[PDB]
Amino acid sequence: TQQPIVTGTSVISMKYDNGVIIAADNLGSYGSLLRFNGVERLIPVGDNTVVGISGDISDMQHIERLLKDLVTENAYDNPLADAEEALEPSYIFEYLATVMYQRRSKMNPLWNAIIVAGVQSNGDQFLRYVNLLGVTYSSPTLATGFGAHMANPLLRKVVDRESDIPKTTVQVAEEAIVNAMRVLYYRDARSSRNFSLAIIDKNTGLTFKKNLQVENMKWDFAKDIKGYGTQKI
Amino acid sequence: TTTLAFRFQGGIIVAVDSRATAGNWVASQTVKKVIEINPFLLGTMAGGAADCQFWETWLGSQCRLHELREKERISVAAASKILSNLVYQYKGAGLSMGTMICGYTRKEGPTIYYVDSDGTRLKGDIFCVGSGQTFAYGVLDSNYKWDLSVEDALYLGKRSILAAAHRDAYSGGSVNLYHVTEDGWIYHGNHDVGELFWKVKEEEGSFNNVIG
Amino acid sequence: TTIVGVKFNNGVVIAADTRSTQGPIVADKNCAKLHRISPKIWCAGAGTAADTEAVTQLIGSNIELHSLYTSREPRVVSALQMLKQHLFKYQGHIGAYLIVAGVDPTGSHLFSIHANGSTDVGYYLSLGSGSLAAMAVLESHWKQDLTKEEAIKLASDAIQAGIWNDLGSGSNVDVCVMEIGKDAEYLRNYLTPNVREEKQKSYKFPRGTTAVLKESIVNICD
Amino acid sequence: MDIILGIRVQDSVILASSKAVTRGISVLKDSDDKTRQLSPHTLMSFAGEAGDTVQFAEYIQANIQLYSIREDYELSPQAVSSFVRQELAKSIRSRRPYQVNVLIGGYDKKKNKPELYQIDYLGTKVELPYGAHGYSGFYTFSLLDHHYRPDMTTEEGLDLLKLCVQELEKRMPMDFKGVIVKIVDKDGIRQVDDF
Amino acid sequence: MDIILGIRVQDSVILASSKAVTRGISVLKDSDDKTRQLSPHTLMSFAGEAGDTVQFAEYIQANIQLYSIREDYELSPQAVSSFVRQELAKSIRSRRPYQVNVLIGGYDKKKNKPELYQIDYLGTKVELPYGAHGYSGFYTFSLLDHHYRPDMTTEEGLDLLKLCVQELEKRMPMDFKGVIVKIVDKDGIRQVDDF
Amino acid sequence: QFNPYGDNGGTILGIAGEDFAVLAGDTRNITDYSINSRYEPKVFDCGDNIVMSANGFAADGDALVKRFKNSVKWYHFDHNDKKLSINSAARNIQHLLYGKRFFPYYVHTIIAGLDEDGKGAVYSFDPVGSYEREQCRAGGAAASLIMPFLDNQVNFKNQYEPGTNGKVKKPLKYLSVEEVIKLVRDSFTSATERHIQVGDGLEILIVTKDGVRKEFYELKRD
Amino acid sequence: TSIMAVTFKDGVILGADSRTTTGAYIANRVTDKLTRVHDKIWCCRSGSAADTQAIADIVQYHLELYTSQYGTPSTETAASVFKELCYENKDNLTAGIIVAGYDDKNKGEVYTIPLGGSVHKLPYAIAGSGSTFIYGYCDKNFRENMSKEETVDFIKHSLSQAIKWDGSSGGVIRMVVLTAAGVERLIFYPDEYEQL
Amino acid sequence: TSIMAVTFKDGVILGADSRTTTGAYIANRVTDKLTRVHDKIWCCRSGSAADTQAIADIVQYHLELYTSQYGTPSTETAASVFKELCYENKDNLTAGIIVAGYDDKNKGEVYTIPLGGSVHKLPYAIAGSGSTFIYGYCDKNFRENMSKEETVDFIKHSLSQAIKWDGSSGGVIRMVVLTAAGVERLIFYPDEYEQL
Amino acid sequence: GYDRALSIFSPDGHIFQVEYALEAVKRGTCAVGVKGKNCVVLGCERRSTLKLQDTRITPSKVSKIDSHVVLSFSGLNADSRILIEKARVEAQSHRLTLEDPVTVEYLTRYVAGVQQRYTQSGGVR
Amino acid sequence: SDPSSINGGIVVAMTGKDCVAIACDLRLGSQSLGVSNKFEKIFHYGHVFLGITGLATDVTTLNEMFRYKTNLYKLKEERAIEPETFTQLVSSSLYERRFGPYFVGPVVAGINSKSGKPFIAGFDLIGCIDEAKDFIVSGTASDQLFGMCESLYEPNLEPEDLFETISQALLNAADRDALSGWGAVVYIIKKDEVVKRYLKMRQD
Ligand SMILES: [Mg+2]
Ligand SMILES: [Mg+2]
Ligand SMILES: [Mg+2]
Ligand SMILES: [Mg+2]
């Protein structure tokens, strides 16, 4: 039994025609205090997987160590470690999902919500979610925290079912994600302006964009808003 | 649940309803609340369905092992005590069971043991167990005689469950009847309360509280 | 509930879904959440259904009496003030979360009211369980200088985001448009994107299926 | 308190009420009459929270006796039972509710029919062939469902009652010290002295 | 459970134990023997938490019977009571304690004296002329303080016991369905069949 | 305090014909008022012509199904590739569930297939292993909506022979797979109308001596 | 909330962020927390939005009635009316209010009214959840008799920092200037203040 | 507690107040919260005095053993040992620790370990109850590659403000300087720092 | 714990430690049991190289296991005490669980089982 | 200790072609103990029918109250109250006890005597009006009734058909509820005749 101390807010993600996009801001909150601002919550594993993590940061750092140790262990006595026997997204996910459910079953969870995003060796897109209860699910769009409430509705207008995925390009998908991140910055009181975004494409591989910023924000209309009802000046 | 079992001149009657509930939700009307442990041993189930079901079929296994090791069918006393000693180990952990171990052996005659989840074990001639037990008792006690014919006995047991099925919201579905003699147990059918109530009302002229 | 409000050029539009719930159960698939306070002041309501209805009617009644007394068209800020002071007096226990909009001799107005009695001002607002789905759309597509036709579209899109993504919201979209210099137009079931598909089978019973014990003719006359 | 029963037969209502008054681990009394005559053809038995029971019973009695004197007329059992119900229905939302359950047995002289009403502290009224309050019901309702016929004599009703009390004496955990039995018929109210 | 009594007279110990077994609002049994013979001149009556009572009694019995066979010798009542006390005194600090109170009545053949021991679930032992567990004590201790003499016959002890049971039947709130009475003397243990 | 359980909604439904059995369940997965996925299947082919669904808390459901699938695998390894009969599967699942009696799997479990005479079979389990063979069973969030419909249309409860004076019951009889699927589709559309956690999609696994077939239908997505 | 009011050479300036929050959800990102209770007596609101609005509405009403009968009320008087409401209803209110106004005799004045309903006259005042993070900054950088531009910078830099660290605070920085010249409203958007 | 550690041109400086408190009673007004776990790896302690001492004693022991076997440990290594203890025993610890040390390869380094036992490498770090009040001040005044004297002033001014507003903080300001030159202890008394 | 396999097979298929146990039995004082129509009698030799024996107190050779079953033996006296105690414990445990005293065959089968177990457990003879 | 499920019971209403139907069970229990098999839950004031489930004391009280109010309505207005109007009166009256409510789930059914329209409506305990074209459900087996109605129902059923549908909806819902059943009553209501039928059902 636990309580999260330093936390990361939403992780958002979606499938497009050739791959998956995943994004998450660079903040580590401490209650309402926006304490740490250079926190990377997208952790790449190999060149075919990115694991995005929200919730308790101390537990996230633990999971970083687990994943980085996982890569090492897979290389042992494995001449095909960077080919046919490289770590798949599905392997990395099932591993984490196994851990998350064991920890909840021992009444000592890793206080996190996780999205594993990547491309399998056969080119198929992988996107699945696991959290502190060991609950798992897959969807063409996935998000954690506020993201579930505010990003999913926006990303679902782009990809509302399976058949929409081949029709969605990487430019369209990245736009939707970047837009979603702005909305969360407007509306989530525990989000930051700075974020990281990663694309895993079956042709172009892994692109990892750091130090992005929410831009093109609408604030001008604020000057017209006076009082809370009757006040004129 | 309502379940009962009683001893008389002609052996043992055992009758049970068949309802299972999750609060006020009627989960099933067709639940088997008697387990046939061997041709001379019956067990009744009331309380937690899983607990009763699981541990009474477990009891069957332990009774089978007894007759393999001892070349002799287990006594009702010993069978009931295996179960009571088992549930006593789990005391406080939250098992919920009200059960009756009914059987005939040569050394004992016809015998009924009441065993429940707080470790109580009682030999006796008459018991009713479950949320409808009081309703069953009311009918059973007022019409019970040691001398009842097998026929009258079977009906009284059936009528006593029906009475509880009627008044107790958490009893109902159907009646399952058994007769246990020196020659073992004899099933006496599943009786839907759906039809049994109206048939009894008409033939007996009882249940006048009910708009006929 | 999902409810929204959106300002435009020459007026204001509000919209709402039509689902009513008792826990996980849908009690009403087509309930009206747009309430008339006066001819040109309409209220979208979320929260406890009885409370939104009662508080909207009480203030609507007092507004009519006021309008008659003053020989003037009622103003939104009056409905706003009366609603907020009532809700505040009851310390949150009247669970009414309202988006108040309308036009009056002063202009076009859009406010929201929280059950505890606090009020907002804005060009676009959303309330209820589905308000985050709605607000996501509004924050994505809203701009300064909307036509009537753009605001209607934006509003109903915001409600759709709630209908599809919030389990607390569903069924249909009602809209009401309050434009300066014109009558308010109440667009009940503006959108009906959740029509039940044909059933596979008819369950109309053979007559005499049901066992009957008694009959009698009931006297309803004097 | 605890045991109060009622059976309505052909031409009378019979009320049986336990005699024990128990506080803590002491039976303080074994001859308590848990009943009040409301009018010459109406009897109310009662059970519930200590003090509340008699206070309520006597208050109802005073009201009904007042009505009788004012109108020089006896209120019908149905009319009395409705008055009683309303009093309890008010009470349930008071600052301190009356925690009293009652059976009302009356003979309606205009209909020439006996009537039994069962009302709980919430003000839940129901007319019945037979009734009980408390744990008594859990044994007697099923027993009466079996042995009761609508056309029984007052004598048959008493034997049926003997069955109920015997069952309660067998299976009830507490000693309630027997019952006082009272018959309400066309000739008014009388007490059966040896039960 | 509930009622267990014991009286030590001139040449015997008498134990009286209620016959009712009650669960909820049902008396499940009215002939329950709340006693175990530990040895031919030692009897233990018991009352307390359901299941625990018999499990404890029988466990003690097994131990004492084992001792007898091993040594071909009967342990003295004092020796048995100390064994029992220690078992309960261990139990009280276990994960789940035995919630059982006992009376031990024995005839010491070496002393030619009857002995009554009262032990509660905590392991509180005391030798007494008369004893009781539960609410029974609140009526009988004062009654026995008055009517008890140390040199009474087994017959006089039984009449004294009749006084106690009559008082309990009068003032106790619950029907405990009479008692089974047993006498422990120089000739061992016997049950009085009509009480 | 950490609460180790959650509720993922959904509802499931098993029906047995003469020589087939269906196991159906919706494909919506939820937590609170959010949708996690519109297509997350929860009815699985476990081999040996046994289909299974464990509905409630999905983490527990998945863990159970995984363990049972594994139990089938080892049953083959230990008993010379013997086919695991549905009755034997049922009893095995009881021990899986009851083994966690004091920290239960928060799932209603249903399995379907054919018994050893080739007749259609459905078994249902409570969260701690109480089980029963039935012709008919609904489980999960909308069990209470669907179950009494099945009593009426599958087992013909409360239906009498017309003109017989409520004396002769409508006679029990097996349904075709075509009829059974109509009842399933109508069960889930009705449940979708009135339960917020039920919707999106319906996936049915049908089981005959020739194997396991699937059918999928859209449901309302609000 | 992050709010403040600062006296300077020519009068007083009120500053505030624009975030209204229910938990971590931002119900309003363009709130106006600078409220007029009289021509040149304004207040900064923090705490329960419902409470502080209801209080300000009552105070405005009281000062409107005061004016009709006795002419322009002093800033001290306005602060007293707030206090009376906040003190006497302390059990049912969650309101941290800063009162700020401009007389011609008294120039700029600032009164802060914390939770218990005590009153404190100060050269400047900071309050709201965000204020904790700038006690250090404000104490070090405040001087008496700053110019209008210096004061605007002091508030802009201070609230920028409050907003940076307090998740509850955010949006635009609104300010209201109170001098003999009249009443001026200022607004500063994220792209300006975030990278100070 | 108010504590901080700041990297600068030549190494790193650790600063702390000297107040240990049980409620409002000051159990110790001359506490030393700057604790040596190795020649040039020190930490700042905040939270439970018993917890943070027990942790530092364990860490010192671990690094002494590390040294015997593998030579001088890196500051990162020291921070990891702290983390391991703080993370794995998070349920039973109330410890906010800042780790600071000087390598010759890596120069000055600062790691902060908050309650959950996460680790954060930063140019400077502030922690303890008093830190809340100087987030504003420190963010505005910190520069990278300050000189020793500037850094001492930055810490002195910062902790002066933390102490001014936090009742839990107080006493002397202790500092420890960590350079290639060695290890220097500084102390500053109330009469100097109070009127900065 | 001490683990050594003391009872093992020899090349001729004999377990010597078990066979040497029989030699210790053969050295033991003679015991005989004869069963009648309606009784059973157990007779026992006591070696007469011992006078000044106190026969009140010296362990008698026929032990009661329960009130209805007796056990006598030949071999190591100290070993027999271990078997008798175990047997007595089992007899009470049987009464406790089955509510019936042991049959002679059951009690015999138990004692036999104990003896057998000591022929294929490590650390024991 | 949940007032709405101490006594048990259900009510369902349904519209058909130029008719409405309203039906209820007859059970009144005290939790597990069934007490009366004669407790009807449907009342009428002129041609307007009201069914009330929930706490039985409030059921009785509200009937007595609405009889009271509709009687005075008739005397002052010189005409019988209509369903649309009675629905409003039911709502006003329940909301008047907003912070100490009657624990009931009332259902209104009838045919407007001027327009001939069939009308049904239901309410929560606090007065919210739930109007429906098709069906209204209420009581301890309301989930079951919802599932029965949502599949069994079709529009424009003829009186004798509607009877079968509503009866089958009630009977099967009641049998999946411990606290509902013990008899049923069905009212078929047309422009100017009303038939009342007592259904045969299982008595457990
Ligand atoms: Mg029943
Ligand atoms: Mg929805
Ligand atoms: Mg500690
Ligand atoms: Mg200080």
DSSP state string for chain F: ----------EEEEEE-SS-EEEEEE--EEETTEEEES----EEE-STT-EEEEEESHHHHHHHHHHHHHHHHHHHHHTTT----HHHHHHHHHHHHHTTTTS---EEEEEEEE-TTS-EEEEEE-TTS-EEEESEEEEETTHHHHHHHHHHHTS-TT-B-TTS-S-SBPPP-PPPHHHHHHHHHHHHHHHHHHBTTS-SEEEEEEEETTEEEEEEEE----
What does the DSSP 8-state code read for residue E15? E
Rg (CA), chain F: 18
Question: What CATH number is given to the structural domain containing B74?
Answer: 3.60.20.10
User: Which ligand number lies closest to the CA of residue B197?
Assistant: 1
Domain range E1-195, its CATH number among 3.40.50.1360, 3.40.50.1820, 3.90.550.10, 3.60.20.10 = 3.60.20.10
Tokens of E78: 């004092």
Which residues span the domain enclosing F10? Answer: 1-222
Nearest by CB: C77 against A146, A153, A230: A230
In one-letter notation, the amino acid at residue C105 is P
Q: Is residue C105 classed as helix, strand or coil in its secondary structure?
A: coil
> Is C53 an interface residue toward J (CB < 8 Å)?
yes
SS3 E25: coil
Number of structural domains in chain J: 1
* Joined tokens for residue J67: 């009889």
Orientation of helix B133-143 relative to helix D137-147, angle to 10°: 50
Q: Are A97 and A130 in contact (CB under 8 A)?
A: yes
What's the CATH number where F156 sits?
Answer: 3.60.20.10
* Whether B99 contacts chain E with CB within 8 A: no
Show the tokens assigned to J190: 């047309």
* Cβ–Cβ gap H140/G137 under 8 Å: yes
| Structure token digits, residue A68 | 């980085």
Residue C15 bridge partners (DSSP)? C4, C175
Residue J33 and residue B166: Cα distance in Å, rounded? 9
- Tracing tokens 């029990």 back to the chain, one arrives at F172
The amino acid that residue F12 corresponds to is I
Residue H104, number of CB atoms within 10 A of its CB: 8
Distance CA D146, CA B159 (A): 9
Among B residues 118-177, those touching chain E with beta carbons less than 8 Å apart? 118-122, 124, 127-128, 133-134, 137
* DSSP character string of chain A: -----EEE--EEEEEETTEEEEEEE--EEETTEEEES----EEE-TTSEEEEEEEEHHHHHHHHHHHHHHHHHHHTT-TTTTTTTSPPHHHHHHHHHHHHHHHHHTT----EEEEEEEE-TTS-EEEEEEETT--EEE-SEEE-THHHHHHHHHHHHH--SGGGTTT--HHHHHHHHHHHHHHHHHHBTT--SEEEEEEEETTTEEEEEEEEE--S---GGGGG--SSSS---
Q: What is the CB neighbour count within 10 angstroms for residue A23?
A: 30
Task: Tell me, in angstroms, the distance from the centre of ligand 4 to residue H40's CA.
Answer: 30
CA nearest to C110 within chain A? A229
Asked if the C-beta of A225 comes within 8 angstroms of chain C's C-beta atoms, the answer is: yes
Nearest residue on chain J to B21, alpha-carbon basis: J178
CATH number at residue J137: 3.60.20.10
| DSSP string over G62-79 | HHHHHHHHHSSPPHHHHH
Amino acid occupying residue F22? V
Contacts of B197 in chain J (CB under 8 A): 202-204
SS3 percent helix, strand, coil of chain G, rounded to 5, is 35, 35, 30
Query: Using the beta-carbon criterion (under 8 Å), do C50 and J197 form an inter-chain contact?
Result: no
Closest-CA distance, C220 to chain J, in angstroms, reads 6
Q: How far is the CA of C134 from the centre of ligand 2 (A)?
A: 12
| E159-163 contact pairs (CB < 8 A, 24+) | E160/E7, E161/E5, E161/E7, E161/E14, E161/E16, E162/E195
- Hey, what are B98's tokens? 């009200």
Alpha carbons H61 and F32: distance in angstroms, whole number: 49
Closest to A43 measured CA to CA, from A29, A18, A62: A62
**C210 to chain J: which residues are within 8 Å by CB?**
163-164, 167-168, 171, 199
CATH architecture, domain A1-233 = 4-Layer Sandwich (3.60)
Helix (H/G/I), strand (E/B), else coil: I8: coil
Please tell me the number of the ligand nearest to residue B131's CA: 1
Lookup result for tokens 């012509």: F49
Say how far apart CA D174 and CA I18 lie, in whole Å.
67
Which residues surround the ion ligand 1 when the cut-off is CB under 5 Å?
A: B 169, 171-172; J 204
Chains contacting C (3 or more CB pairs within 8 Å): A, B, F, G, J
State the maximum Cα–Cα separation within chain J, in Å, rounded to a whole number: 47
Which chains pack against A, by 3+ Cβ pairs within 8 A? C, F, G, H
Question: Do G150 and G111 touch, CB atoms closer than 8 A?
Answer: no
Structure tokens at F61: 């459901």
For E175, phi then psi, to 5°, come to: -80, 110
E95 interfaces chain B, CB cutoff of 8 Å: no
Alpha-helix residue ranges (DSSP H) falling in I1-125: 16-27, 77-98, 104-117
C215 min Cα distance to partner chain B (Å): 13
**CA A149 – CA F37 distance, rounded (Å):** 13
Closest Cβ opposite residue A5 in set H114, H120, H135: H114
Q: D-J interface: how many C-beta pairs under 8 angstroms?
A: 36
Angle at F30 between CA J132 and CA J146, to 5 degrees: 25
Tell me the C-alpha to C-alpha distance, in Å, between residue A156 and each of A119, A177, C160, D61. Answer: 20, 11, 12, 72
> What burial class does residue J107 get, using C-beta atoms within 10 Å of its C-beta: 0-12 exposed, 13-18 middle, 19+ buried?
buried
Task: Give the right CATH number for C1-222 from 3.40.50.720, 3.40.50.970, 3.60.20.10, 3.30.70.100.
Answer: 3.60.20.10
If residue E101 lies in a helix (H) or strand (E), which one and from where to where? strand E100-108
CA angle, B138 then B144 then B146, to 5° = 155
Among G134, G130, G159, which residue's Cα sits nearest to residue G14?
Answer: G159
Supply H18's token pair: 């000297």
Distance between Cα A177 and ligand 2 center (Å): 23
Contact J14, J134 (CB under 8 A): yes
* Helix boundaries (H) for chain D: 52-71, 77-91, 137-147, 154-171
Resolution in A: 2.7
Whole-number Cα distances in Å, A205 to A93, A208, E163, I65: 19, 10, 98, 82
- Whole-angstrom CA distances from A47 to A69, A88, A170, C88, F127 are 16, 10, 18, 57, 42
Distance from the alpha carbon of residue F220 to the mean position of ligand 2, in angstroms: 10
3-state DSSP of E127-195: ECCEEEEHHHHHHHHHHHHHHCCCCCCHHHHHHHHHHHHHHHHHHCCECCCCEEEEEEECCEEEEECCC
- Cα(A157) to centroid of ligand 2, in Å? 15
Counting every residue written for chain E, the total comes to: 195
The two structure tokens encoding residue G60: 């405005």
Q: Is B77 annotated as a binding residue?
A: no
Long-range contacts of range B205-208, CB-CB < 8 Å, 24 or more positions apart? B205/D149, B206/D145, B206/D146, B206/D147, B206/D148, B207/B166, B207/D145, B207/J203, B208/D129, B208/D148, B208/D149, B208/D150
Least Cα separation, residue C107 to chain F (angstroms)? 36
Q: Which amino acid is at H173?
A: I
Beta strand H95-102 pairing with H41-47: antiparallel
Comparing CA positions, the residue from H46, E46, A167 lying closest to residue H55 is H46
DSSP I88: H
> How long, in residues, is chain G?
196
Ligand closest to CA H161: 4
Catalytic site residue G1? yes
Which of F26, F151, F187, F222 to mutate to test binding with chain C, by most C CBs within 10 Å of its CB? F222
Strands G34-38 and C212-218: unpaired
CATH of region H1-196: 3.60.20.10
| Residues of G within an 8 Å Cβ radius of A | 18-19, 21, 23-26, 29-32, 35-36, 49, 53, 129, 164-168, 170-172, 183, 185, 187, 189-191, 194
Q: How far is the CA of H115 from the centre of ligand 4 (A)?
A: 23
Distances from the Cα of A6 to the Cαs of A3, A193, G21, G130, H78, in angstroms? 10, 18, 20, 19, 21
The domains of chain C are located at: 1-222
User: How many angstroms separate the Cα of H166 from the Cα of each of A168, G31, H130?
Assistant: 55, 31, 5
The CA angle H59-H64-H66, to the nearest 5 degrees, is 90
Of E58, E59, E69, the CB nearest to I66: E69
> How many angstroms separate the CA of residue J147 from the nearest CA in chain C?
11
Q: Choose among C88, C91, C120: nearest Cβ to G28.
A: C120
Distances (CA, A) of E45 to C128, E15, E123: 68, 7, 15
CB C110 within 8 A of CB C5: yes
Contact: C135, A187; criterion CB under 8 Å: yes
- DSSP secondary structure string for all residues of H71-92: SSPPHHHHHHHHHHHHHHTTTT
Chains D and E touch (3+ CB pairs under 8 A): yes
At least 3 CB pairs under 8 A between chains A and H:
yes
Q: Residues 181 to 220 of A: which have CB under 8 A from any G CB?
A: 186-190, 193, 217, 219-220
> In which residue are the tokens 């027999």 written?
I80
**Could you give the C-alpha distances from D49 to B112, D6, D56, F44, in angstroms and in order?**
40, 20, 11, 58
Q: Which long-range contacts link G56-63 to residues 24+ away (Cβ below 8 Å)?
A: G56/G97, G58/G85, G59/G85, G60/G36, G63/G37, G63/G38
H or E element at residue J104 = strand J104-111
| Closest approach of J139 to chain B, Cα-based (Å) | 12
- Report how many Cβ contacts below 8 Å link chain F to chain J: 53
Two tokens, residue H62: 């671990």
H or E element in which residue H101 lies: strand H95-102
Rounded to whole angstroms, the maximal C-alpha distance in chain F is 62
Residue H114 to chain A, least CA–CA distance (Å): 8
Do the strands E113-119 and E125-127 form a parallel or antiparallel pair, or are they unpaired?
Answer: antiparallel
What residue of F is the nearest CA neighbor of C205? F159
Task: Tell me the CA–centroid distance for residue E39 and ligand 1, in Å.
Answer: 51
Ligand 2 center from residue G57 Cα (angstroms): 38
Residues spanned by the domain of J203: 1-204
- How far apart are alpha carbons C2 and C21 in whole angstroms? 12
Measured CA to CA, the distance from residue E33 to residue E26 in angstroms comes to 18
Residue for token pair 């069905």? J186
- Distance (Å) from the alpha carbon of B173 to chain J's nearest alpha carbon: 7
DSSP type of residue H1: -
Dist. CA B13 → ligand 1 center (Å): 22
The angle at the Cα of D129, spanning D123 to D132, to the nearest 5 degrees, equals: 50
Query: Based on C-alpha coordinates, what's the Rg of chain H?
Result: 16
| Tokens (6 digits) for G84 | 């009376």
| J128 at C interface, C-beta within 8 A | yes
| Phi/psi at H110 (5° precision) | -130, 125
- Burial degree of B114 (CB within 10 A; 0-12, 13-18, 19+): buried
H131 vs H2: CA distance, rounded Å: 6
